[PDB]
Design an enzyme around this catalytic site. Structure first.
Site, PDB file in Angstrom:
ATOM      1  N   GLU A  35      42.257  77.140  65.191  1.00 33.62           N
ATOM      2  CA  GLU A  35      41.498  77.411  63.981  1.00 33.62           C
ATOM      3  C   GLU A  35      41.595  76.285  62.957  1.00 33.62           C
ATOM      4  O   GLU A  35      42.671  75.738  62.723  1.00 33.62           O
ATOM      5  CB  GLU A  35      41.965  78.732  63.358  1.00 33.62           C
ATOM      6  N   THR A  54      35.609  75.571  62.648  1.00 29.53           N
ATOM      7  CA  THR A  54      35.723  76.797  61.864  1.00 29.53           C
ATOM      8  C   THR A  54      34.865  76.885  60.606  1.00 29.53           C
ATOM      9  O   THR A  54      34.137  77.864  60.411  1.00 29.53           O
ATOM     10  CB  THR A  54      37.198  77.051  61.458  1.00 29.53           C
ATOM     11  N   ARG A  56      31.545  89.409  68.797  1.00 31.53           N
ATOM     12  CA  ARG A  56      32.723  89.351  67.941  1.00 31.53           C
ATOM     13  C   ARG A  56      32.453  88.535  66.685  1.00 31.53           C
ATOM     14  O   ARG A  56      32.288  89.095  65.602  1.00 31.53           O
ATOM     15  CB  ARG A  56      33.906  88.747  68.699  1.00 31.53           C
ATOM     16  N   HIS A  58      33.498  74.745  69.755  1.00 33.52           N
ATOM     17  CA  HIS A  58      33.023  75.965  69.105  1.00 33.52           C
ATOM     18  C   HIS A  58      32.503  75.579  67.729  1.00 33.52           C
ATOM     19  O   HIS A  58      33.243  75.593  66.749  1.00 33.52           O
ATOM     20  CB  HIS A  58      34.207  76.932  68.993  1.00 33.52           C
TER      21      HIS A  58
END
Ligand SMILES: CC(=O)SCCNC(=O)CCNC(=O)[C@H](O)C(C)(C)COP(=O)(O)OP(=O)(O)OC[C@H]1O[C@@H](n2cnc3c(N)ncnc32)[C@H](O)[C@@H]1OP(=O)(O)O
Ligand SMILES: CC(=O)SCCNC(=O)CCNC(=O)[C@H](O)C(C)(C)COP(=O)(O)OP(=O)(O)OC[C@H]1O[C@@H](n2cnc3c(N)ncnc32)[C@H](O)[C@@H]1OP(=O)(O)O
Ligand SMILES: [Zn+2]
Ligand SMILES: [Zn+2]
EC number: 2.3.3.21
Lengths: 311, 311
Positions: A140, A173, A10, A201
């Site tokens: 995010e 992000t 993705r 992440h």
């Protein structure tokens, strides 16, 4: 004791000039789950288009055949019923909701109130559950949000804790954090919510993503996101191959990844995606095991056969 | 306030399939010193061969013309008079001595005593000074040496402190350190010898070199080693482009590097060396500034024109 989420299909697909066919995505999905043994895979974004819908359906058809449906995840959005419907038809059973982790993003893109937006969020989670799906939530721009709008971020998490979601994702992000910073922001949240499953992440804009990831593990994260060959939009995501090796050798935490399938996962992604990796790419580059000037004196814990190479 | 040593032309040359011509080395040397503005450059290893000797002579001929001779350094060895003679004829005025930083290496390669070896070392520094050269000393395998033979390492440094050398280099030769470890080993030495100029020299085997480098800066290092595009034997050295950007944005320390010449330095090295960099290579890859899915909301402190690109 650490889950690994692969977003190669993705986040990695968003990369310029990269687009996987249904056959390639199925091939890669099977390999990562069965061979490399990554806990879960994020194979797509909902509402992207038809075909991508078909693709997810085939993978779900297969994943069902193998009792792995709960290991596939879809990136969704706060659009009311559209995302949940799409994922509902796709066959997928898990939604990773994209929410605004920074007051700056919420206002400049949505122009909404933390209250209004939380209501929109609660609807989606509400409707998603009602539709048989499970939910993970992405904050995010969290990397900028906990450093500028720490209040908005604390209430957002406060709100999500009263919701029935599986995990909360803390993404860098824009990939702007240093390891010290990553530790602070993550420790901050883990200490207020000791009962929530958080996952870091990172992005590699400063080539600090796996170092950041290590500090997140210190702060108390229970999972990490990464992509093969660090595939991703800008400098890509945290490079899966180096992250795992680093987690295994430089941390007391573990992973369920089979180090041996690491070289093939890389070759697979490199070919199919069409993005060449440098010969010196850590752990997984062509010449990374070759020492021409070194004259087992220069034995590195990083051996070719450990990752299924040269034997 | 932080010196930057570029080893692109030497350590970077050791890479498999890489070999720079006299013209290419001169071109790169001029650019790094005059355009990129790196404090010093390590262009070669003594006794490698003739031609390489010629090459260093031309660069010294030029460097003299520009009052930069003191900014060029040569990797030498503890061979009595051979290295110093070679560097003496080369034209170079600085020698970076390669010494054994681990008791394991000293015994398995030399089979000597810390006493014997120190005498050989003292001769070379002695003879080098006597020959008009300046000396920096590499504690090869120091990363393994301070974790297994910490005593040998403390005496080696103790010995070098009684010598008239310019700097002591702490290299993660095999690239096996984590940032926490790099801080410990470096802090250990800086606190015992507050008056010595130490520089960290990391390798990217676990993709931790610039993170390690940051911790070294914390521990009190006064200089750092790096190569363009992370060129080097295995995974290469610390990637110069990401190190500097990271030092500038994520640390209170500074550098004299001109961020603007960074993209050209990379292209130069990539072409001449023949080692292609990935499109996602941090700071310096082709697609590193492109965000196709990001829909100045996603403004990163890493802009194309900041490094002399897209304008
Ligand atoms: C962490 C490190 O950087 S380990 C460094 C080890 N070697 C070097 O840095 C030298 C690099 N060599 C070159 O670039 C060569 O010109 C090459 C590789 C391009 C072509 O020739 P090669 O024979 O392949 O180079 P090689 O790999 O042998 O280089 C090793 C050098 O270390 C020298 N060396 C190492 N220790 C000693 C010592 N104690 N006494 C004398 N010489 C030594 C070897 O003699 C050799 O140089 P020399 O044989 O010409 O005198
Ligand atoms: C950090 C991040 O990952 S930001 C993520 C932003 N976008 C995505 O993740 C979707 C990726 N898109 C794709 O892969 C597309 O299929 C492409 C790029 C391959 C081809 O089509 P494109 O139009 O270029 O995709 P695009 O870049 O527009 O994707 C952005 C999607 O975010 C959707 N989106 C973002 N926020 C919202 C929202 N609040 N409500 C509804 N949709 C939203 C956009 O609508 C778009 O999907 P849709 O227009 O089809 O409904
Ligand atoms: Zn991302
Ligand atoms: Zn080196």
């Amino acid at each position: 004791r650490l889950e690994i989420l692969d977003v190669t299909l993705r986040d990695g697909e968003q990369t310029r000039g990269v687009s996987f066919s249904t056959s390639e995505k199925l091939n890669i999905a099977k390999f990562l789950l069965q061979k490399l043994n990554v806990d879960r895979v994020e194979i797509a974004s909902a509402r992207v288009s038809k075909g991508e819908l078909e693709t997810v359906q085939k993978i779900m058809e297969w994943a069902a055949t193998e009792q792995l449906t709960e290991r596939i995840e879809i990136l969704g959005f706060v659009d009311g019923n559209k995302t949940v419907d799409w994922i509902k038809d796709s066959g997928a059973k898990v939604l990773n909701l994209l929410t605004k982790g920074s007051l700056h993003h919420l206002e400049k893109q949505l122009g909404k109130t933390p209250k209004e937006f939380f209501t929109d969020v609660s609807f989606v989670i509400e409707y998603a559950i009602k539709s048989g799906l499970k939910i993970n939530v992405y904050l995010e721009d969290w990397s900028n949000g906990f450093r500028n709008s720490p209040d908005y971020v604390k209430s957002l998490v406060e709100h999500l804790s009263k919701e029935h979601i599986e995990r909360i994702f803390l993404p860098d992000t824009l990939g702007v954090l240093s390891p010290e910073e990553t530790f602070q922001g993550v420790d901050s949240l883990i200490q207020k919510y000791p009962d929530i499953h958080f996952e870091f992440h990172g992005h590699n804009d400063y080539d600090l993503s796996v170092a950041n990831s290590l500090q997140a593990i210190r702060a108390g994260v229970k999972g990490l996101h990464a992509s093969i060959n660090g595939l991703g939009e800008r400098a890509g995501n945290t490079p899966l191959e180096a992250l795992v090796t680093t987690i295994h050798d430089k941390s007391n935490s573990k992973t369920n990844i089979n180090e041996i399938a690491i070289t093939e996962a890389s070759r697979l992604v490199e070919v199919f995606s069409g993005k060449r990796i440098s010969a010196n790419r850590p752990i997984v580059g062509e010449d990374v095991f070759t020492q021409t000037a070194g004259v087992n004196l220069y034995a590195n814990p990083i051996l070719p056969e450990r990752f299924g190479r040269k034997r």
